């Protein structure tokens, strides 16, 4: 049938092709699909000659339900296969398998496909264009897909935050404990907490009545991303040991991971509690691999992974105490 | 030969296997690899019985150069193939092809492999374990790999920022223009600027002497990720039209994309100027797809993609003017 179009969708399908060698093959598929009612976006007739920029191709993809990907032996050699073809390929295999319609011409060897396209289910179109009705089937089919979050979270957290606060953070923390007379009861490392469920708390004082907000480090003011005087503040807390003595520390959660928790709770999002654990562990590895490259930032902070499934109002305070032990022992 | 170990690497290889059906096959490969000098991490002997948690497996992967992935017909059915096996698979095909050593037992059909493993180059190990020396080759080989950043950037930017400021932002902007008497010369939509090169500026006033910092919106103070009183501030600028009249607007860059610029400039990072354009366009699509789901946030802001390759000190001011035109016209 002719599926009705969602609001952003103005085309039924966008024909992604290599204009050097398959601009004639793509035009043939255009007629085969539009003859049976569908409205497609063909670059030669629907774009302006000078308005074939990368963003214009992207808007057509954003405004089309499906994307017919024309792949030929000659197209895999041109720069199109390593540039504009990939802009129609999503990381989420869920969206790829529903949105992308690969069409293999001539040599249909799936092994020759780049790694992005190799695990996809493609249609073999004969040299006489007889499987053209197979293409029409994938366009008639009328839960948000989730790609991989590990690399985006880790690289952004490093360049966009850790690279900002961690340089000369030792002096800032040591100058804080000397002013407040916290020697022997406060470390100099920034503690980044990584709960297993990724459920970040508004304040570490929400874990137990033993954690108390005790101040903050000097505010880092920076004009970034067009926001003038964006504040980067680090909060100081304190835990009470079993011996009634207060140990201080600069602590915070890895707040970027809280998105994985919110996506898991959002029933419309395609991220279940099982993949959340996978995405969080790929994030843990990637971030720790990035920190190994920068030794002046890695050893100025301490990542602490733990489970937060138990309801013990004492499990979290003693964990922070046992974590400051190592830091004070190493000093 | 026996390759020397990098600092975090304490094992030559981590044997990732399904303990239900291949715990005996994995032990066989352990002896075949350790007999020739390599130090491996085998779960049955190197982990404690109760200390086989997901994070412990991850630390072993972080502390091993290579990862030998044992894959059998019976392992693809257990939950291990859909959970712990994927934690050794990186999104970056560059790191995967160098670090991951897939070992196919019994049925070696690459089509049966999940999409993460299907585009990989695997070793067929016979039922008599004769290709065991092939495994040793991939472990002897002694530029940072970059996965895909689109989904991590887009989902984080939405839940972690847009979902915070955009609700009831119309009243905040309209209350700002009514107080400063900016009717007819100021819109009510937040302008998110998306330069093609991803080079975000510290202040939009850095584009031209016509852009002036003219204040900010009321500060949004929130305890998030354990940081008490984290400020979310939106800056107000003003452009000067060709007629000398000042048009106001709330504007800012999509600062998450600046990481792609810094990774491109960092010569050690495996992200060139060509993939940066690909990753930025996958990000543009993914973010706009996310915003379509939330119609109360999408239509309260305006993404503006443009080229910033020219040095025109007038191209940017007139672009902001032509962008406020549509918003004032639609009011
Ligand atoms: N614990 C903690 N304290 C902070 O001050 C802080 N600031 C940033 N981050 C996290 O590190 C990374 C920095 O990347 P980036 O700035 O490019 O993207 C940011 C940025 O583009 C935008 N954003 C967030 N907060 C603001 C803000 N106050 N003003 C403007 N834009 C903002 O939304 C993206 C994601 O924000 P978060 O989801 O809060 O986590 C960030 C991010 O993962 C912080 N983490």
Overview of the structural elements:
The structure is a homodimer of 331-residue chains. In chain A, 35% of the residues lie in helices and 21% in strands. In chain A, helix 6 (150-165) packs across helix 9. Chain A has a five-stranded parallel sheet with strand order 2-1-3-4-5. In chain A, strands 7-10-11-6-12 form a five-stranded mixed sheet. In chain A, strands 8-9 form a two-stranded antiparallel sheet. Chain A folds into two domains: 11-139, Rossmann fold, CATH 3.40.50.10140; 150-329, Stimulator of interferon genes protein (Rossmann fold, 3-Layer(aba) Sandwich), CATH 3.40.50.12100. Chain A contains eleven helices and twelve strands. At the A-B interface, helix 3, helix 6, strand 8, strand 9 and strand 11 of A face helix 3, helix 6, strand 8, strand 9 and strand 11 of B. The PDB classes it as immune system.
Helix and strand string of chain A, N-terminal first?
A: EHEHHEHEEHHHEEEEEEHHHEH
Most extensive interface between two protein chains, with residue counts? A-B, 83 and 83 residues
Largest sheet of chain A: 5 strands, parallel
The fraction of residues assigned to DSSP E strands of chain A is 15-25%
CATH homology-level superfamily of the largest domain in chain A: Stimulator of interferon genes protein
> How many distinct helices of chain A?
11
The general outline of chain A is elongated
Q: Specify the helix fraction band of chain A.
A: 25-40%
CATH topology of the largest domain in chain A: Rossmann fold
Largest sheet strand order of chain A: 2-1-3-4-5
Structurally, the number of domains of chain A stands at 2
Oligomer: homodimer
Return the CATH architecture of the largest domain in chain A. 3-Layer(aba) Sandwich
Structural class of the secondary structure composition of chain A?
A: alpha/beta
Radius of gyration of chain A: 27 Å
Based on DSSP secondary structure assignment, what is the total number of beta strands of chain A? 12
| Ligand types | cGAMP
CATH class of the largest domain in chain A: Alpha Beta
PDB class: immune system
Keywords: TIR domain, cyclic dinucleotide receptor, immune effector, immune system
Assembly: dimeric
Entry title: Structure of a metazoan TIR-STING receptor from C. gigas in complex with 2',3'-cGAMP
């Amino acid at each position: 049938s002719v599926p009705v179009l969602r609001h952003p969708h103005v085309y039924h399908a966008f024909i992604s092709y290599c204009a050097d060698a398959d601009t004639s093959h793509a035009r043939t598929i255009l007629d085969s699909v539009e003859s049976r009612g569908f409205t497609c976006c063909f670059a030669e007739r629907d774009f302006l000659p000078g308005e074939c920029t990368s963003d214009v191709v992207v808007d057509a993809i954003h405004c089309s339900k499906n994307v017919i990907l024309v792949i030929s032996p000659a197209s895999l050699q041109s720069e199109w296969s390593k540039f504009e073809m990939l802009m129609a390929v999503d990381d989420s295999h869920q969206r790829n398998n529903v949105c992308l319609v690969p069409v293999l011409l001539g040599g249909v060897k799936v092994d020759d496909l780049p790694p992005p396209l190799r695990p996809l289910t493609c249609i073999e179109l004969m040299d006489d264009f007889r499987n053209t009705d197979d293409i029409i089937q994938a366009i008639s089919k009328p839960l948000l897909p989730v790609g991989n979050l590990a690399h985006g979270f880790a690289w952004g957290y490093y360049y966009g935050y850790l690279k900002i606060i961690l340089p000369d953070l030792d002096k800032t923390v040591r100058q804080w404990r000397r002013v407040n007379n916290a020697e022997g009861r406060m470390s100099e490392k920034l503690f980044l907490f990584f709960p297993q469920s990724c459920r970040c708390r508004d304040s570490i004082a929400d874990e137990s009545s033993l954690i108390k907000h005790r101040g903050h480090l000097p505010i880092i003011t920076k004009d970034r991303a067009g926001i003038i005087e964006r504040q980067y503040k680090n909060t100081i807390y304190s835990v009470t040991d079993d011996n009634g003595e207060d140990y201080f520390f600069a602590g915070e959660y890895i707040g970027v991971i809280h998105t994985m928790f919110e996506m898991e709770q959002n029933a419309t999002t395609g991220l279940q509690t099982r993949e959340k654990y996978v995405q969080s562990m790929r994030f843990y590895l990637t971030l720790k691999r990035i920190l190994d490259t920068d030794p002046e930032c890695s050893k100025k902070c301490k990542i602490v992974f733990y489970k937060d499934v138990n309801n013990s109002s004492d499990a979290m305070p003693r964990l922070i105490c046992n974590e400051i032990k190592n830091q004070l022992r190493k000093e």
